[PDB]
């Protein structure tokens, strides 16, 4: 839960076979980090999708 910690690779246990996947500090697609991003996020909320 920190960007410092979130580097390198981790063992993914999703495909039922372990695979090393990169550790990426990503941001959610709709994220309120701005009054313009919040506007688009709330638009998607109002449409319900």
């Amino acid at each position: 839960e920190l960007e410092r910690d979130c580097r390198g690779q981790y063992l993914d246990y999703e495909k039922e076979e372990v695979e090393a996947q990169p550790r990426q500090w990503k941001k959610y697609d709709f994220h309120y980090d701005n009054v313009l991003w919040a506007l688009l996020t709330l638009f998607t909320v109002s449409t319900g999708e």
């Binding site: 910690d5 580097r7 390198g8 690779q9």
Partner: protein, 930 residues
């Protein structure tokens, strides 16, 4: 064959050799001293390494900025391509020059140490970068250790941060960067790290199988309990209990059982079969756990009593149960909050605080592997505070090296945090070990301290643990121990499982575990190497304790092996004359010669392709005189002397006759290494081991003072029996100065047709079968059984075989092979336990007649045992009658689950635990519950 001719050859040349004694007591004492010298050399290396590691970490200053000062290291999981762009932001990566070394069998760099970092662990972190900085001193000490002892194998620093820094820089095994090859290796889960990081445990894993753990949480709990069991060694004792309003054992075990592979699999299956249902009661589960930790009627590691609570959460701190059972706090309680949930974790975290434990969260698969390493991290607190008494070298069970070297043991030593000492500072986390130092000892490093070539093929050494597991044994193979029926663990084979178990052998095993020294001559049931025959052997076990270690070395030695032939070849031209008889050009004057691929010369490389090794051996014999300290004088002298002896038989007694109607191949095999077979046309069909000490017929024929008929293999596509013959062998029994020596085994590959004719020729003066020991069909007269030559009798006609067993002309011993590769059934080839049986002449009587009461009919048979050989003639006269062929006596490696471990933990084998262990210290800071 020429038994008497070769005997006369041997006594005719008593001036060419000296009969020396195989003093078993002296041999065992010398080999035990050699083993303790090797292990003390490795212990000294470990002490050097741990001293420097503590000294250099204690003088390390923390940093959070390694860009201004990079750490230069070789990452083991790095591609050999010169990629300058493959450097982490905070570290410079070495690109090494790799030589190929025979001692390791891989690419090895002696200039620097390599570092393993788990994929789950980022190598640019502050923790890892600080470790990579202060471990370079370990690097140069690695170099010093190797230069003071060039025979050193891997010497490694397993760090508590996840890094493993091992000296000979070698790339990681196959998982550097490879699809389908993921590196799950973590040094803190290795058996040597776990062994050296704490004292033996007494876990009771409490599993919370109530309603609230259904679905994902139960899956995580069962995987977590499996991975928790996978950190338990053979000195730890474990039980798994589950509670939901009442506690019960998950498995057939009712008490703490030893955490060996088979018991651990029982517990793992019991956990996998567990179900979630009912309400929780943390009081009736902890009552059960504490009661089971107080059960002293059973074998235990009387140390480190633990409870591992695998719950999710709840609102029950269970004060009064802990007060009643854990008041002086002799038992630690580690609590795990498994799963992704919102239940109250407060009581779970408090149980860890009030009980010297630690609290862990496992929210998903992927967090499972690390928290277990962490309870081990907690358990080492009393070991650190017991500063230098704890730094004792321990030797791991035999296991398979990760960077493949086969079977190794490894000596461990904890490394402590020494930042504040005699300059006392806060010392916050100075209660944790820095890591464990390891040094590898190959089992082939021990096998050359126990030389077997002055011994009979039936004689050998073997060492033993205090658990009874063999450090050294001819029957211990580099394969994982089979654990049941198929659907990173030690190769722990017990002594009573490597051999055939008598009761004398159990007493000897207990005496060896106790560290006593003694001797015991007795009659054994020696199973043959091909694992189809059993001999009533006559052995002398002499054992000593290997001082300074918990091992115990013994020497098995037949009564006819107390003397051996030390070749007196010093004329330098007599041995040359014997040499020219070895060259692969005279394989029609002398027989088709095989030399045993032994370590005659340091520069000979042994090969399975025996003619290649024969060429190399002849080349080395050509120019030998300047090679005084390179070639083992005794082995080459013995093989040359025996080559001369077998030449004076293949020429002076076979080449003067050159052909006999009944034979198909005449062979002589010597304990020196020569296995000449005459015709060289049937010498191609000769498929016995070039090494004479690994020949099943040779060792079989030394026990019997008869002629041993080695039945061929049925349904085996190769040289066969019709076009190769069926083997007959007798061992020469020469006498020199009244000493019985059996230095060679002459033999005959009797032709099947020349013998079937003589079998049916005298019928004028149909069912008649020839059987040897083990009930194998040498042939019949029915000409349909002779199609199945060398097959077990019970496969052919089970009724008569079972009856003959019933009269006890054939006894049998059913045993378990724990190291057999296995075709996996359904609920490539895996490893299982096979259940192998061997038949043999039970009684010394010669004639056996009776009535075979087949169902609703009757059959009459007569069995007679041919004198001076291992054969029986069964004159059974009944064919095509009513079928009592209801089943079969399949004598083979029947895949089976081994002995019921539920039953053999109630009467377990004798076992000695570690003496000194560290728990329950008062200087300990229990306030780190996490």
């Amino acid at each position: 064959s020429g038994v008497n001719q070769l005997v006369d050859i041997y006594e005719k040349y008593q001036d060419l050799y000296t009969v020396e004694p195989n003093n078993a007591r002296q041999l065992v004492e010398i080999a035990a001293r050699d083993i303790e010298k090797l292990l003390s050399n490795r212990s000294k290396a470990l002490v050097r390494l741990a001293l420097e590691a503590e000294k250099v970490q204690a003088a390390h200053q923390w940093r959070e900025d390694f860009a201004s000062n990079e750490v230069v290291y070789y990452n083991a999981k790095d591609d050999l391509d010169p990629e300058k762009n493959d450097s982490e932001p905070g570290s410079q990566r070495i690109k090494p020059v790799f030589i190929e070394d025979a001692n390791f069998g891989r690419q090895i760099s002696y200039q620097h140490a390599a570092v393993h970092i788990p994929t789950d662990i980022y190598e640019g972190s502050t923790i890892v970068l600080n470790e990579l900085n202060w471990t370079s001193a370990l690097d140069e000490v690695f170099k010093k250790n190797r230069e003071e002892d060039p025979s050193l194998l891997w010497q490694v620093f397993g760090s508590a941060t996840g890094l493993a820094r091992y000296y000979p820089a070698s790339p990681w095994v196959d998982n550097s960067r490879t699809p389908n090859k993921i590196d799950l290796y973590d040094v803190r889960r290795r058996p040597w790290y776990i062994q050296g990081a704490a004292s033996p445990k007494d876990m009771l894993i409490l599993v919370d199988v109530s309603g609230s753990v259904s679905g994902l949480t139960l899956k995580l709990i069962r995987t977590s309990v499996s991975e928790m069991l996978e950190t338990l060694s053979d000195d730890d004792f474990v039980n798994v209990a589950s509670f939901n309003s009442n506690a019960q054992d998950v498995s057939c075990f009712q008490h703490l059982v030893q955490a060996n592979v088979r018991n651990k699999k029982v517990l793992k299956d019991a956990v996998n079969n567990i179900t979630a249902k009912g309400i929780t009661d943390y009081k009736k589960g902890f009552s059960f756990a504490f009661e089971q930790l107080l059960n002293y009627n059973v074998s235990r590691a009387n140390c480190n009593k633990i409870i591992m609570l695998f719950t999710d959460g709840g609102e029950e701190r269970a004060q009064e149960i802990f007060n009643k059972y854990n008041k002086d706090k002799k038992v630690r309680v580690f609590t795990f909050s498994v799963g992704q949930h919102n239940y109250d974790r407060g009581p779970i975290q408090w149980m860890a605080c009030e009980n010297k434990g630690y609290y862990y969260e496992i929210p998903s698969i992927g967090a499972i592997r690390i928290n277990t390493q962490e309870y081990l991290d907690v358990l080492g607190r009393p070991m650190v505070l017991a500063g230098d008494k704890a730094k004792q070298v321990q030797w791991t069970n035999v296991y398979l090296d990760a960077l493949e070297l086969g079977l190794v043991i490894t000596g461990t030593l904890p490394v402590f945090n020494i930042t504040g000492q005699f300059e006392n500072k806060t010392n916050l986390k100075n209660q944790l070990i820095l890591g464990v130092m390891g040094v590898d000892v190959s089992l082939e490093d021990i096998k050359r301290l126990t030389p077997r070539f002055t011994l009979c093929p039936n004689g050998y050494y073997f060492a033993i643990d205090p658990n009874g597991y063999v450090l050294l044994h001819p029957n211990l193979q580099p394969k994982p121990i089979g654990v049941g029926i198929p659907t990173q663990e030690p190769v722990t084979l017990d002594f009573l499982d490597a051999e055939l178990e008598n009761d004398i052998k159990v007493e000897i095993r207990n005496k060896m575990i106790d560290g006593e020294s003694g001797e015991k001559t007795f009659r054994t049931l020696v199973k043959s190497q091909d694992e189809r025959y059993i001999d009533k052997g006559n052995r002398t076990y002499t054992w000593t304790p290997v001082n300074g270690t918990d091992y115990s070395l013994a020497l098995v030695l037949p009564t006819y092996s107390f003397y051996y032939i030390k070749a007196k070849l010093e004329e330098t031209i007599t041995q040359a004359r014997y040499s020219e008889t070895l060259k692969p050009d005279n394989f029609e004057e002398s027989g088709y010669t095989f030399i045993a691929p032994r370590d005659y010369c340091n520069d000979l490389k042994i090969s399975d392709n025996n003619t290649e090794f024969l060429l190399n051996f002849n080349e080395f014999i050509d120019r030998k005189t300047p090679n005084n300290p390179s070639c083992n004088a005794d082995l080459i002298n013995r093989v040359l002397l025996d080559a001369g002896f077998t030449n004076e038989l293949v020429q002076n007694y076979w080449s003067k006759q050159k052909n006999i109607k009944g034979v198909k191949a005449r062979f002589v095999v010597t304990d020196g290494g020569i296995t000449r077979v005459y015709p060289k046309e049937a010498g191609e069909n000769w498929q016995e081991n070039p090494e004479t000490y690994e020949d099943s017929f040779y060792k079989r024929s030394l026990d019997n003072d008869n002629y041993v008929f080695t039945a061929p293999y049925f349904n085996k596509s190769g040289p066969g029996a019709y076009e190769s013959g069926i083997m007959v062998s007798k061992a020469v029994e020469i006498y020199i100065q009244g000493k019985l020596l059996k230095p060679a085994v002459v033999g005959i590959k009797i032709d099947v047709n020349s013998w079937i004719e003589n079998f049916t020729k005298t019928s004028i003066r149909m069912d008649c079968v020839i059987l040897d020991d083990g009930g194998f069909l040498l042939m019949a007269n029915h000409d349909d059984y002779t199609n199945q030559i060398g097959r077990f009798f019970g496969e052919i006609d089970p009724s008569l075989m079972r009856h003959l067993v019933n009269i006890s002309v054939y006894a049998f011993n059913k045993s378990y092979d724990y190291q057999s590769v296995c075709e996996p059934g359904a609920a490539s080839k895996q490893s299982c336990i096979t259940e192998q049986t061997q038949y043999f002449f039970d009684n010394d009587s010669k004639s056996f007649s009776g009535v075979l009461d087949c169902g609703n009919c009757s059959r009459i048979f007569h069995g007679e045992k041919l004198m001076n050989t291992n054969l029986i003639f069964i004159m059974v006269e009944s064919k095509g009658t009513c079928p009592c062929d209801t089943r079969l006596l399949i004598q083979a490696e029947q895949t089976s689950d081994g002995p019921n471990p539920c039953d053999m933990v109630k009467q377990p084998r004798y076992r000695k635990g570690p003496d000194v262990c560290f728990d329950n210290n008062v200087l300990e800071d229990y306030t780190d519950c996490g």
